[PDB]
Design a protein around this ligand. Structure first.
Ligand SMILES: Nc1nc2c(ncn2[C@@H]2O[C@H](COP(=O)(O)OP(=O)(O)OP(=O)(O)O)[C@@H](O)[C@H]2O)c(=O)[nH]1
Ligand SMILES: Nc1ncnc2c1ncn2[C@@H]1O[C@H](COP(=O)(O)OP(=O)(O)CP(=O)(O)O)[C@@H](O)[C@H]1O
Ligand SMILES: Nc1nc2c(ncn2[C@@H]2O[C@H](COP(=O)(O)OP(=O)(O)O)[C@@H](O)[C@H]2O)c(=O)[nH]1
Ligand SMILES: [Ca+2]
Ligand SMILES: [Ca+2]
Ligand SMILES: [Ca+2]
Ligand SMILES: [Cl-]
Ligand SMILES: [Mg+2]
Ligand SMILES: [Mg+2]
Ligand SMILES: [Mg+2]
Ligand SMILES: [Mg+2]
Lengths: 447, 54, 420, 357
């Protein structure tokens, strides 16, 4: 068994973290006080769930997790909430005043002053590990802490833990719930400085989750609570292989091996089905074929984009519940004859499939209905680059006028950092295009 | 449509299906960047205080 | 980002500030004795932003009352909520400022300002994490204008990394006490351009016109004007005072509203103003007749906007209506700042209303206000009329020339982004 | 009030659509780079589909189908037909075609030469035509009975070409003994309804067809620009060398005792529907966050047996002068107002067929 440390940065990171750890406790049969009756080895062990939980002598199962925010109100809610007994104070780190939606404030001004404390607190967790694998890092792109502090942390983590993998769960900005005009700047700045330190990042666009909640959960105006419970289900699907017995994606290294053949192009698209309202009186349970087919609908993706118009480098199907391989393969056969699924020439056309027999756990009093079977597809498709194009375009509009730039220069960032970050993003868009697009015959209109 | 590497356990199973085959900065450096930005805040603040002194 | 320290200076500044404290005290369930008698936990959650706690569950405004004569503050102390203020926080002189910026900034005000800073320092010292300062004043008199801007400069020197926010009443010949108002306002605007992060521009002409044309008040008093200002200040500070995600502190507001450091002068608006559905609220809040800077929004473009809705209403409908405004008048929102309108909603409505909305716009149209003042300044300055009142306090004409140039530069910078 | 942007200033069809939308009084034209639009009249190349359908509160629609270029490029079309089972290598209505890459750059050269030599030994007609998508109007084309000239021609070029069997027995109009091709306009709406404009046009040659000389490409190529320039008889038989369906139908009756509908349009409709239904899953916007429509120009040849052959599909057609008003109003009615309703006897034929087997 090899441990994984989770790090939750800024409001989005912390709130999503809280939702994930609640769900993990329910999936593993861990009570809010940390006791786990089904666990017959008191005070330690090397079971798969021990990848995410250590154990005290008293039999408490403690998340291998650190929470960091530059103001205290969000983490205070963890300290006082339902799962408070799970955590001890050395895992909860708060500053007094936040980064004011300013990457430069988070990275340079405040980050310089709290970074060493955060590393000491992570080291305390690392020292408990017999075979630390690496880190799972949760944060928004748009917040000053989620953007600026995360990139600083990621850099220092590569220094202090050079051989360890680092995965991200990153929240991409959507004006329907965003809280700052400068979020495109923060997103591009943090993506630029983090790119080389991250081995695999799962981007979730708040726009996509928001609309899934509206459309499929019949929630008129989704809140972060609604959004985060859904995000937690997708995260759990993705990390299930680390926490349960299995032979697919069983360590962080395998995520990169299976999903990221090309290091800069390390952003797999997640797609999830089914999402069904708990308020739904009558519901016909969906088959393996029906939920698998749903994985190729943009409406169920964590980022709205069109994979028919890009290419795949890798595809993983992760099932939970009543699923056997024969039905998966029958489903895939059918889907091949109906969908546009083109792989790059230098990868095989295929799917890696994991099945865990336990159906998804739902949080009591949640919005999601219990289902007999669910699936999360992780595909590395160049189509996700549509999201980089959208962001880069917004950046360009504001930066051309230097709108808001003074806020960043005022925290000691050089203006050159903007253009450096943006050039890095231009090259990224180009890499996606090169990998994903065949030239289109030119013409000598009005024909 | 070949199934390979089928692995089974009590908790589930995994396998692969193939349809077709194919054809960092150091601590010193980070420190220096953080200190350089601090120097810039310090300079901009000194300039402000000079203007207020005038 | 917790505590704000409030300063109110001069006659206008103190009269509007007193009303502001009465209004938000009522909203937070605080009675004139500083005792809490509310029924909602939302009332207390962020009460510490504006109030200190004292022995016996008493809440005391973090407020400093400044004037160069005793009259208005004597009246405040005799007012409804007058006993709620900290007695040691009344700081005043006897000689007055004679509607003279020079007296406020260089002579009379200079003699009092250290004692004001002593009280400011005492309040700041008991802050766990001071966000910054909010100042209420007029720009047309002597104390609020001259001494208020002197205070702002000294506060910035001592707290250079804190936010400075002002509610600044702009003079108008239609609602005027003296002829030198344009000189005082020009001298002040240059101070504000340099030393505030956020300034709410409240034009006395707009207040008057709303009272007379819209509210049907045949003969508006300063009291009637101040009722509007009260209501507006309550609305624009809602996000600081209650639980919320957007613009929840002074710096986050600045970062969302100010794309270039000097262009930080906002037009506020309020709805309803009547002699109510979400659509109606939304149309009225964007209505020029509901705004308080006497500038026509259609004569410019919005760089940024904050909208705040109060009351129990459908957030779904709020979002729908705000989108409808932007999508149907998209030309009035600069295209080079994507998604530049942010909306907040607070469940607690102001007194006497089931729902309301408050508007904060950073619009290039605000140049019209500075243009009006600039014209009025020049009409007199070209003949050096009334200047002896200022030269007698040691000022020279060159300082007037420089202030006028500075304000004309501000006007030019707005116009540049209007054509961008 | 609906809003739209114009990003292709060169489009005659959409310049007229723009004019119409404005005159309803219920559409406003935004600056081209303002993102808060309902309708994008997009640019021909590198249209940013990825920025569409991410605007809260705005249903967004664009006048191009992302992916439709597969049908609308010379070499892409050949490949689409040969590799799609329901069109196929044995497709009866598309002339035998081969994709040829100039040697200085997969390539079907040897496959072509194989078929060419088979025809030669068999005494069969062996005239082929080399062309590409880069063929600026009347240039970039070679008609020859010698494989060597064809391949040499292509090798001097820098872009993919198609070599395609040249139809040596075209239906010839009388008087004049002359060739023509048929242009049909087809509108595919956001529901993937396929609408054939009731008016097509024959673009004619005004020079007698002469099989003994494929060098003089005036009786052989029916391009308007070619005819208008090199034909000394341009406009002798019909204005602008355009014959419309009323006259062509009357000719078919008088001369061949048949109708346009029976002898030709049945086939045209079959080909159009077959082509568009083939690519539907690749381009449909049915469950997408933005929607598309697109106007296509299909070009057909008719042989002396009244068999219809598809030659190409144009992704950005212009229209005949006298047909603009009607077609463009039709586009507004069926492609735009269908999605954005304003506050007959269609001009289109809806193509649909559901045979049970
Ligand atoms: N899905 C989701 N998104 C969130 C949540 N909280 C914030 N966001 C998004 O994150 C972005 C704002 O960043 P935050 O995480 O709030 O900022 P922060 O990291 O605390 O940084 P500062 O407050 O600037 O110090 C916006 O795009 C929000 O919509 C959450 O709980 N869930
Ligand atoms: N296989 C073939 N047999 C006979 N004639 C052919 C042919 N291929 C092309 N032509 C002639 O050449 C013309 C079409 O050439 P091509 O289609 O490359 O030009 P083009 O692409 O400019 C037409 P458009 O303006 O619709 O785009 C037809 O009008 C026809 O007269
Ligand atoms: N809205 C409003 N404006 C006022 C009030 N009192 C004075 N004014 C305005 O304030 C300016 C005069 O300044 P004032 O505050 O009285 O002078 P000070 O005591 O020297 O600061 C003029 O423009 C007046 O119209 C008031 O109570 N409300
Ligand atoms: Ca154990
Ligand atoms: Ca590394
Ligand atoms: Ca004195
Ligand atoms: Cl290591
Ligand atoms: Mg925060
Ligand atoms: Mg007065
Ligand atoms: Mg043709
Ligand atoms: Mg063509």
């Amino acid at each position: 068994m090899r441990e994984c440390i989770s790090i939750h940065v800024g409001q989005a990171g912390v709130q999503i973290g809280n939702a994930c750890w609640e769900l993990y406790c329910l999936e593993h049969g861990i009570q809010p006080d940390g006791q786990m009756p089904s666990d017959k080895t008191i005070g330690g062990g090397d079971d798969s769930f021990n990848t995410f939980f250590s154990e005290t002598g008293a039999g408490k199962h403690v998340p291998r997790a650190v929470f960091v925010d530059l103001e205290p109100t969000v983490i205070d809610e963890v300290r006082t909430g339902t799962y408070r007994q799970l955590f001890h104070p050395e895992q909860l780190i708060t500053g007094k005043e936040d980064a004011a939606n300013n990457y430069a404030r988070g990275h340079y001004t405040i980050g310089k002053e709290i970074i060493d404390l955060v590393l000491d607190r992570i080291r305390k967790l690392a020292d408990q590990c017999t075979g630390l694998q690496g880190f799972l890092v949760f944060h928004s792109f748009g917040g000053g802490t989620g953007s600026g502090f995360t990139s600083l942390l990621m850099e220092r983590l590569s220094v202090d833990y050079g051989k360890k993998s680092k995965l991200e769960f990153s929240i991409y900005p959507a004006p329907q719930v965003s809280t700052a005009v400068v979020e495109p700047y923060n997103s591009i700045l943090t993506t630029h400085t983090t790119l080389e330190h991250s081995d695999c990042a799962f981007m979730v666009d708040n726009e996509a989750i928001y609309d899934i909640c509206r459309r499929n959960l019949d929630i008129e105006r989704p809140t972060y609570t609604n959004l985060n419970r859904l995000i937690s289900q997708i995260v759990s699907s993705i990390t299930a292989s680390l926490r349960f017995d299995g032979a697919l994606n069983v360590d962080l290294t395998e995520f990169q091996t299976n999903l990221v053949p090309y290091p800069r192009i390390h952003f797999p698209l997640a797609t999830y089905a089914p999402v069904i309202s708990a308020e739904k009186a009558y519901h016909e349970q969906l088959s393996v074929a029906e939920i698998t087919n749903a994985c190729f609908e943009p409406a169920n993706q964590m980022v709205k984009c069109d994979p028919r118009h890009g290419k795949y480098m890798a595809c993983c199907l992760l099932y939970r519940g009543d699923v056997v391989p024969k039905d998966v393969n029958a489903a895939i056969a059918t889907i091949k004859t109906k969908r546009s699924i083109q792989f790059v020439d230098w990868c095989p056309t295929g799917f890696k499939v994991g099945i865990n027999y336990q159906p998804p756990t739902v949080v009591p009093g949640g919005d999601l209905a219990k289902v007999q079977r669910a699936v999360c597809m992780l595909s590395n498709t160049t189509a996700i680059a549509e999201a980089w194009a959208r962001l880069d375009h917004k950046f360009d509009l504001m930066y051309a006028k230097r709108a808001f730039v003074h806020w960043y220069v005022g925290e000691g960032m050089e203006e050159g950092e903007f253009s450096e970050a943006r050039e890095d993003m231009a090259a990224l868009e180009k890499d996606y295009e090169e990998v994903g697009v065949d030239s289109v015959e030119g013409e000598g209109g009005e024909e | 449509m070949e199934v390979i590497e089928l692995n089974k356990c009590t908790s589930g199973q995994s396998f692969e299906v193939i349809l077709k085959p194919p054809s960092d900065p150091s601590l010193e450096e980070i420190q220096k960047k953080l200190e350089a930005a601090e120097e810039r805040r310090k300079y901009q603040e000194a300039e402000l205080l000079k203007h207020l002194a005038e | 980002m917790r505590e704000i320290v409030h300063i109110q200076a001069g006659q206008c500044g103190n009269q509007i500030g007193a009303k502001f404290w009465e209004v938000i005290s009522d909203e937070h369930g605080i009675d004139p004795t500083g005792s809490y008698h509310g029924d909602s936990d939302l009332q207390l959650e962020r009460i510490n932003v504006y109030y200190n706690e004292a022995t016996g569950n008493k809440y005391v405004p973090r407020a400093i009352l400044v004037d160069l004569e005793p009259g208005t503050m004597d009246s405040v102390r005799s007012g409804p909520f007058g006993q709620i203020f900290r007695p040691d926080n009344f700081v005043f002189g006897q000689s007055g400022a004679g509607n003279n910026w020079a007296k406020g900034h260089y002579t009379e005000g200079a003699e009092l300002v250290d004692s004001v800073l002593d009280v400011v320092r005492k309040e700041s010292e008991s802050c766990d994490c001071l966000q910054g300062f909010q100042l209420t004043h007029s720009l047309g008199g002597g104390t609020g204008s001259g001494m208020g801007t002197l205070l702002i400069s000294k506060i910035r020197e001592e707290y250079p990394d804190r936010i400075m926010n002002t509610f600044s009443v702009m003079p108008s010949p239609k609602v005027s006490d003296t002829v030198v108002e344009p000189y005082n306002a020009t001298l002040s605007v240059h101070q504000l351009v340099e030393n505030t992060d956020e300034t709410y521009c409240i034009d006395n002409e707009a207040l008057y016109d709303i009272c007379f044309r819209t509210l049907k008040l045949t003969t508006p008093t300063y009291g009637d004007l101040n009722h509007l200002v009260s209501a507006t200040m309550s609305g624009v500070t809602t996000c600081l005072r209650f639980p919320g995600q957007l613009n929840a502190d002074l710096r986050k507001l600045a970062v969302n509203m100010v794309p270039f450091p000097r262009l930080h002068f906002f037009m506020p608006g309020f709805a309803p103003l009547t002699s109510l559905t979400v659509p109606e609220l939304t149309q009225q809040m964007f209505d020029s007749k509901n705004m308080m800077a006497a500038c026509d929004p259609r004569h410019g473009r919005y760089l940024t906007v904050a909208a705040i809705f109060r009351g129990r209403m459908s957030m779904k409908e709020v979002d729908e209506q705000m989108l409808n405004v932007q999508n149907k008048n998209s030309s009035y929102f600069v295209e080079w700042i994507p998604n530049n309108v942010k909306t907040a909603v607070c469940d607690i409505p102001p007194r006497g209303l089931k729902m309301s909305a408050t508007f904060i716009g950073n619009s290039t149209a605000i140049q019209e206000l500075f243009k009006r003042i600039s014209e009025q300044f020049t009409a007199m300055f070209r003949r050096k009329a009334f200047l002896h009142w200022y030269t007698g306090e040691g000022m020279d004409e060159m300082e007037f020339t420089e202030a006028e140039s500075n304000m004309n530069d501000l006007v030019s910078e707005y116009q540049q982004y209007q054509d961008a | 009030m609906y809003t739209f942007v114009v990003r292709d200033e060169n489009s005659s069809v959409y310049a007229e659509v723009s004019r119409l939308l404005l005159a309803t009084g219920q559409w406003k034209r935004l600056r081209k780079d303002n993102p808060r639009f309902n309708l994008m009249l997009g640019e021909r190349n590198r249209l940013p589909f990825g920025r569409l359908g991410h605007e809260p509160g705005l249903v967004q629609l664009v006048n191009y189908y992302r992916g439709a270029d597969k049908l609308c490029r010379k070499a892409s079309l050949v490949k689409l037909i040969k590799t799609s089972p329901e069109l196929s290598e044995s497709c009866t209505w598309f002339p035998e075609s081969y994709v040829i890459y100039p040697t200085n750059l997969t390539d079907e050269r040897e496959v072509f030469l194989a078929a060419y030599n088979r025809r030669r030994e068999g005494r069969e007609g062996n005239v082929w035509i080399a062309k590409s998508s880069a063929g600026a109007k009347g240039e970039g084309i070679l008609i020859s009975s010698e494989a060597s000239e064809l391949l040499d021609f292509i090798d001097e070029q820098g872009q993919v070409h198609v070599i395609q069997k040249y139809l040596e027995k075209p239906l010839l109009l009388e008087p004049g003994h002359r060739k023509f091709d048929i242009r049909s306009w087809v509108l595919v709406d956001h529901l993937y309804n396929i609408y054939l404009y009731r008016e097509g046009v024959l673009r004619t040659s005004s020079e007698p067809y002469n099989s003994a000389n494929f060098q003089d490409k005036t009786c052989h190529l029916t391009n308007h620009c070619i005819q208008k320039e090199y034909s000394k008889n341009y406009g002798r038989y019909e204005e602008g060398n355009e014959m419309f369906f009323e006259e062509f139908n009357q000719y078919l009756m008088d001369a061949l005792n048949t109708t346009l509908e029976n002898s030709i349009l049945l086939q045209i409709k079959h080909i159009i529907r077959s082509c568009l239904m083939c690519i539907e899953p690749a381009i449909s916007t049915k469950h997408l966050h933005y929607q598309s429509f697109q106007l296509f120009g299909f070009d057909f040849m008719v042989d002396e047996e009244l068999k219809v052959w598809l030659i190409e599909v144009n992704g950005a057609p212009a229209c005949a002068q006298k047909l603009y008003a009607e077609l463009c109003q039709g586009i507004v009615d069926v492609a735009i107002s269908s999605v954005f309703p304003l506050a007959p006897t269609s001009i289109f034929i809806k193509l649909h067929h559901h045979h049970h087997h």
